[PDB]
Short mmCIF file of C-alpha atoms in Angstrom, two decimals:
data_model
loop_
_atom_site.label_atom_id
_atom_site.label_comp_id
_atom_site.label_asym_id
_atom_site.label_seq_id
_atom_site.Cartn_x
_atom_site.Cartn_y
_atom_site.Cartn_z
CA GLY A 1 106.22 46.40 84.97
CA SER A 2 106.89 50.15 84.91
CA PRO A 3 104.38 52.89 85.85
CA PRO A 4 102.17 53.92 82.87
CA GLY A 5 103.69 56.09 80.17
CA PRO A 6 102.31 59.63 79.85
CA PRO A 7 99.53 60.22 77.36
CA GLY A 8 100.29 62.59 74.50
CA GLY A 9 98.77 65.08 72.11
CA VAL A 10 97.20 67.13 74.89
CA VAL A 11 95.04 69.68 73.09
CA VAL A 12 92.50 72.33 74.13
CA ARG A 13 89.10 73.14 72.62
CA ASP A 14 85.85 74.85 73.78
CA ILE A 15 87.69 77.69 75.49
CA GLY A 16 85.47 79.58 77.91
CA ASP A 17 86.33 82.34 80.33
CA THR A 18 86.55 79.89 83.25
CA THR A 19 86.67 76.45 81.58
CA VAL A 20 88.22 74.51 78.72
CA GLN A 21 87.75 71.05 77.20
CA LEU A 22 91.02 69.12 77.34
CA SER A 23 91.72 66.08 75.12
CA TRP A 24 94.53 63.55 74.87
CA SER A 25 95.29 59.94 73.81
CA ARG A 26 97.59 57.00 74.55
CA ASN A 30 99.48 52.00 75.51
CA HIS A 31 99.76 48.44 76.87
CA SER A 32 99.44 48.73 80.67
CA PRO A 33 95.98 49.22 82.24
CA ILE A 34 95.31 52.81 83.33
CA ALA A 35 93.09 53.30 86.38
CA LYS A 36 93.05 57.13 86.56
CA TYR A 37 94.30 60.29 84.82
CA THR A 38 95.38 63.38 86.76
CA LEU A 39 95.44 66.88 85.21
CA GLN A 40 97.64 69.91 85.94
CA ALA A 41 97.83 73.51 84.72
CA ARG A 42 100.32 76.35 84.86
CA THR A 43 100.41 79.94 83.71
CA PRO A 44 103.54 80.41 81.58
CA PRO A 45 106.33 81.25 81.53
CA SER A 46 107.22 81.24 85.24
CA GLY A 47 104.17 79.62 86.84
CA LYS A 48 104.30 76.43 88.90
CA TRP A 49 102.19 73.43 87.91
CA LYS A 50 98.98 73.26 89.94
CA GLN A 51 96.10 70.79 90.09
CA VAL A 52 92.84 71.60 88.33
CA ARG A 53 89.22 70.73 89.07
CA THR A 54 87.70 68.48 86.42
CA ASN A 55 84.34 67.35 85.10
CA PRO A 56 83.97 64.48 85.63
CA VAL A 57 85.60 64.72 89.06
CA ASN A 58 87.42 61.43 88.47
CA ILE A 59 88.95 60.78 85.04
CA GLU A 60 88.69 57.06 84.27
CA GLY A 61 91.48 55.20 82.48
CA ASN A 62 89.35 54.74 79.38
CA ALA A 63 88.69 58.48 79.07
CA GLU A 64 90.41 60.70 76.52
CA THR A 65 88.72 63.99 77.40
CA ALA A 66 87.92 66.09 80.47
CA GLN A 67 86.39 69.49 81.20
CA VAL A 68 88.71 71.73 83.20
CA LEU A 69 86.96 73.95 85.75
CA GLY A 70 87.83 76.96 87.87
CA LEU A 71 90.09 78.94 85.56
CA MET A 72 90.45 82.73 85.57
CA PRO A 73 89.29 84.93 82.64
CA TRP A 74 91.82 86.39 80.22
CA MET A 75 94.65 84.22 81.54
CA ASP A 76 97.36 82.18 79.79
CA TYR A 77 97.48 78.44 80.53
CA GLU A 78 99.40 75.29 79.66
CA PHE A 79 97.95 71.90 80.70
CA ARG A 80 99.42 68.41 81.14
CA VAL A 81 98.16 64.90 81.98
CA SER A 82 99.59 62.02 84.04
CA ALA A 83 98.46 58.37 84.14
CA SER A 84 98.19 56.19 87.26
CA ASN A 85 97.64 52.46 87.92
CA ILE A 86 98.60 49.84 90.51
CA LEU A 87 102.27 50.66 89.87
CA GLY A 88 101.72 54.35 90.71
CA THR A 89 101.95 57.39 88.45
CA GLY A 90 104.17 57.74 85.40
CA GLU A 91 105.74 60.94 84.10
CA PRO A 92 103.46 63.77 83.01
CA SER A 93 102.75 64.48 79.34
CA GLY A 94 104.41 67.29 77.47
CA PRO A 95 102.37 70.47 78.00
CA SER A 96 99.57 71.57 75.64
CA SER A 97 100.28 74.59 73.47
CA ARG A 98 99.54 77.82 75.41
CA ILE A 99 95.94 79.05 75.30
CA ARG A 100 94.28 82.17 76.69
CA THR A 101 90.89 81.94 78.37
CA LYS A 102 88.14 84.23 77.10
CA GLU A 103 87.60 87.75 78.44
CA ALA A 104 85.08 88.75 81.10
CA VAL A 105 83.79 92.14 82.25
CA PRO A 106 86.03 93.68 84.92
CA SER A 107 85.15 92.43 88.39
CA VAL A 108 85.83 95.42 90.65
CA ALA A 109 84.98 99.13 90.50
CA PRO A 110 87.79 101.68 90.29
CA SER A 111 88.79 103.11 93.67
CA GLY A 112 89.93 106.52 94.82
CA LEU A 113 87.33 108.56 92.94
CA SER A 114 87.57 112.26 93.72
CA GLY A 115 88.37 115.52 92.01
CA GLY A 116 88.18 119.30 92.23
CA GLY A 117 90.15 122.25 90.90
CA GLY A 118 91.06 123.19 87.34
CA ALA A 119 90.53 126.30 85.21
CA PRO A 120 87.30 128.36 84.92
CA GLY A 121 84.44 126.26 83.55
CA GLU A 122 86.20 122.93 84.30
CA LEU A 123 85.17 119.85 86.27
CA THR A 124 88.20 117.77 87.19
CA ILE A 125 87.83 114.14 88.17
CA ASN A 126 90.51 111.76 89.48
CA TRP A 127 90.76 108.07 90.36
CA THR A 128 93.16 105.19 90.97
CA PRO A 129 93.99 103.21 87.79
CA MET A 130 93.16 99.49 87.92
CA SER A 131 96.08 97.06 87.72
CA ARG A 132 96.18 94.31 85.11
CA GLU A 133 94.98 91.66 87.58
CA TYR A 134 91.44 93.09 87.56
CA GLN A 135 91.17 94.24 83.92
CA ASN A 136 89.94 90.81 82.67
CA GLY A 137 90.36 91.59 78.97
CA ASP A 138 91.77 93.93 76.33
CA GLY A 139 90.20 97.23 75.22
CA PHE A 140 90.04 98.34 78.84
CA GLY A 141 88.89 101.82 79.89
CA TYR A 142 86.70 103.81 82.24
CA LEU A 143 83.18 105.17 82.03
CA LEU A 144 82.47 108.30 84.03
CA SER A 145 78.99 109.57 84.75
CA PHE A 146 78.37 113.01 86.18
CA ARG A 147 75.51 115.40 86.77
CA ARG A 148 74.92 118.64 88.68
CA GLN A 149 74.01 117.70 92.22
CA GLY A 150 70.22 117.91 92.30
CA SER A 151 69.53 117.11 88.65
CA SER A 152 68.54 113.66 87.39
CA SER A 153 69.95 113.32 83.87
CA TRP A 154 73.51 111.91 83.63
CA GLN A 155 76.26 112.96 81.25
CA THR A 156 78.84 110.30 80.50
CA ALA A 157 82.40 110.08 79.25
CA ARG A 158 84.08 106.93 78.01
CA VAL A 159 87.88 107.06 78.15
CA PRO A 160 90.01 104.09 77.01
CA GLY A 161 93.38 103.02 78.45
CA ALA A 162 93.96 101.36 81.83
CA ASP A 163 96.50 104.05 82.80
CA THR A 164 93.88 106.82 82.48
CA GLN A 165 93.80 108.38 85.94
CA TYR A 166 91.92 111.63 85.42
CA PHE A 167 89.40 113.39 83.21
CA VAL A 168 88.64 117.08 82.77
CA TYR A 169 85.40 118.31 81.25
CA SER A 170 84.71 121.94 80.38
CA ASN A 171 81.57 123.83 79.51
CA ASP A 172 80.95 127.61 79.59
CA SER A 173 77.70 126.96 81.45
CA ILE A 174 79.61 125.58 84.46
CA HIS A 175 79.86 128.19 87.25
CA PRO A 176 82.73 128.14 89.76
CA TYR A 177 82.59 125.58 92.59
CA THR A 178 79.45 123.81 91.24
CA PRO A 179 78.79 120.50 93.05
CA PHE A 180 78.50 117.43 90.77
CA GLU A 181 77.51 113.82 91.56
CA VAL A 182 80.10 111.55 89.97
CA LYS A 183 80.53 107.80 89.58
CA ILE A 184 82.90 105.59 87.63
CA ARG A 185 82.95 102.05 86.25
CA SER A 186 85.57 100.24 84.24
CA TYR A 187 84.88 98.29 81.07
CA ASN A 188 86.61 96.17 78.49
CA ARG A 189 85.96 94.67 75.05
CA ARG A 190 83.51 92.28 76.76
CA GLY A 191 81.36 94.91 78.55
CA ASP A 192 80.92 97.22 81.56
CA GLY A 193 82.14 96.38 85.07
CA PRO A 194 80.47 97.32 88.39
CA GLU A 195 79.98 100.97 89.35
CA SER A 196 81.72 102.84 92.15
CA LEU A 197 79.97 104.55 95.00
CA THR A 198 78.89 108.06 94.00
CA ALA A 199 81.20 110.94 95.01
CA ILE A 200 80.47 114.67 95.27
CA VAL A 201 83.06 116.61 93.24
CA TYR A 202 83.12 120.40 92.98
CA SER A 203 83.89 122.09 89.67
CA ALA A 204 86.91 124.46 89.65
CA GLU A 205 86.73 127.40 92.10
CA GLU A 206 88.09 130.82 91.09
CA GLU A 207 91.81 131.13 91.87
CA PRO A 208 92.75 133.64 94.62
CA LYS A 209 92.99 137.21 93.27
CA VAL A 210 94.32 139.02 96.39
CA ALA A 211 97.70 139.06 98.14
CA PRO A 212 98.39 139.04 101.89
CA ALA A 213 98.89 142.77 102.64
CA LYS A 214 101.83 142.36 105.04
CA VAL A 215 104.43 139.72 105.93
CA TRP A 216 106.75 139.66 109.00
CA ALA A 217 109.80 137.40 108.93
CA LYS A 218 112.34 136.83 111.72
CA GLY A 219 115.32 134.51 112.07
CA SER A 220 114.76 132.54 115.27
CA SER A 221 118.05 130.65 115.12
CA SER A 222 120.91 129.94 112.73
CA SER A 223 118.78 127.74 110.51
CA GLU A 224 115.19 128.69 111.23
CA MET A 225 112.78 131.51 110.46
CA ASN A 226 109.31 132.32 111.82
CA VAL A 227 106.99 133.88 109.26
CA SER A 228 103.70 135.65 109.92
CA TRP A 229 101.29 137.51 107.70
CA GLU A 230 97.94 139.21 107.50
CA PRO A 231 95.34 136.74 106.26
CA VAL A 232 93.49 137.37 103.01
CA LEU A 233 89.90 138.31 103.84
CA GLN A 234 87.54 135.77 102.29
CA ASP A 235 84.51 137.31 100.65
CA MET A 236 81.50 135.02 100.15
CA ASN A 237 82.00 132.58 97.24
CA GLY A 238 85.77 132.89 97.78
CA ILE A 239 87.64 129.65 98.42
CA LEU A 240 90.94 129.67 100.30
CA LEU A 241 92.81 126.47 101.20
CA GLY A 242 95.90 128.06 102.74
CA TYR A 243 99.07 129.92 101.85
CA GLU A 244 102.22 129.26 99.95
CA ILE A 245 105.39 130.68 101.42
CA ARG A 246 108.38 131.23 99.14
CA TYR A 247 111.81 132.12 100.43
CA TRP A 248 115.21 132.63 98.85
CA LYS A 249 118.68 133.98 99.71
CA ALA A 250 119.45 137.61 98.96
CA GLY A 251 121.53 137.49 95.79
CA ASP A 252 119.68 134.53 94.33
CA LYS A 253 116.92 134.65 91.74
CA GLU A 254 113.41 134.92 93.18
CA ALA A 255 112.24 132.35 90.62
CA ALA A 256 114.46 129.74 92.25
CA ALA A 257 112.80 130.23 95.69
CA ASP A 258 111.90 127.21 97.81
CA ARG A 259 108.16 126.78 98.43
CA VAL A 260 106.18 125.57 101.45
CA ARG A 261 102.40 125.42 101.90
CA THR A 262 100.17 125.64 104.94
CA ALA A 263 96.65 124.23 104.99
CA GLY A 264 94.01 125.89 107.14
CA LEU A 265 93.51 129.35 108.62
CA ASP A 266 96.99 129.60 110.16
CA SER A 267 98.62 132.98 109.46
CA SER A 268 102.10 131.96 110.46
CA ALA A 269 104.59 129.21 109.72
CA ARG A 270 108.04 128.02 110.71
CA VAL A 271 110.68 127.54 108.05
CA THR A 272 113.67 125.30 108.79
CA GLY A 273 116.81 124.08 107.02
CA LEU A 274 118.23 127.55 106.33
CA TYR A 275 121.88 128.66 106.23
CA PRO A 276 123.49 130.45 109.19
CA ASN A 277 124.19 134.19 109.08
CA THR A 278 122.21 134.63 105.85
CA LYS A 279 119.68 137.21 104.65
CA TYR A 280 116.44 135.84 103.14
CA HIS A 281 113.54 137.30 101.20
CA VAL A 282 110.08 135.89 101.85
CA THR A 283 106.78 136.21 100.06
CA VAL A 284 103.39 134.75 100.88
CA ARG A 285 100.47 134.06 98.56
CA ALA A 286 97.02 132.49 98.93
CA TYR A 287 96.13 129.23 97.16
CA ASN A 288 93.22 126.95 96.43
CA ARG A 289 92.67 124.02 94.04
CA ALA A 290 92.59 126.44 91.10
CA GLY A 291 96.10 127.81 91.77
CA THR A 292 97.87 130.67 93.58
CA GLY A 293 97.06 134.35 93.94
CA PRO A 294 99.51 137.27 93.53
CA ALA A 295 102.47 137.59 95.91
CA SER A 296 102.58 139.79 99.03
CA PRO A 297 105.21 142.53 99.25
CA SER A 298 108.43 140.74 100.16
CA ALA A 299 109.75 140.71 103.68
CA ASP A 300 113.30 140.08 104.80
CA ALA A 301 114.94 138.25 107.67
CA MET A 302 118.39 137.12 108.68
CA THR A 303 119.35 133.85 110.32
CA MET A 304 121.58 134.14 113.40
CA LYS A 305 125.34 133.57 113.46
#
């Protein structure tokens, strides 16, 4: 008069990407219903699963499991119930992996810009394993000159791929491109991102600020001002990079701070009291920095 013993020999066949066919067998006591559970090893908790048929009769030895995730590891087990309640669950089936599916989201964070002459640089956020949905994962980039119709594409494998640089001598500086990205795996292509406008590399700055003024404003702070670099048409300027170092130290070891905008002055903090500093300023954009200004000097107060 004990609750029914667990069935045994739980095995899996007909593995889909979202379903499997589970089988088992028994054996004296009448069984009214079977209940099925699944977990994702090794550290997953046992959870209930949807079945077809919805109710597994006591004479049944097979059930379709519904509502699984693609490319996922699962173990399954079965329990038997009658008027005396439910017995212990079976031992778990041997681990299976559901089939792969195309990835289900588009990569995010698509952008780009910068690089060397003749380059188009493109960047994005790599997709974490939870959305990859299969092995042989990678990204498919499509790009064309803004205005044109024909796409060029680039297929790059590896989920950790987070940028791509293309170069062609026919690409002029700061050329606008339409760009879009989709992920893919062994099973096929995922959905495409919104299109982004990405400019090819601009020319790096070629001119230095002509004059820099630096003055210690306290024992640990310095105000720095300079003459802006005159932008000629086509010229791109994002801001300035200020470098400063103690007299007696190597220029190459200078700290670096950047502005962003048309400001022609900056405040530098965290300096040492009663100390002489050298300061240079240079222009920058996404292609790099220009040559340095003549150095200026300043002393922090006592």
